[PDB]
């Protein structure tokens, strides 16, 4: 039940090869649901499933 700055939700956390912009925080797909979140302390790209 991850909570990355207010985002309550369930899903696995794994490192992903994606690369955000420095200001970009969140990842969304064509269906407008979260699938990529950046860690607010150790800035990294994680995949949500």
């Amino acid at each position: 039940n991850f909570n990355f700055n207010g985002l309550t939700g369930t899903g696995v956390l794994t490192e992903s090869n994606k690369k955000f912009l420095p200001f970009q925080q969140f990842g969304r797909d064509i269906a407008d649901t979260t699938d990529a979140v950046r860690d607010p302390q150790t800035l990294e790209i994680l995949d949500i499933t």
Binding site: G11, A31, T33, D35, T49
Partner: peptide
Amino acid sequence: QKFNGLTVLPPLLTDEMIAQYTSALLAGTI
């Protein structure tokens, strides 16, 4: 495999075996 409950059930007849049915359908008429 989608996020919000939506699951896609694969077809009973896979793409490989239906190809075998087709080849059977061709084979008889040829």
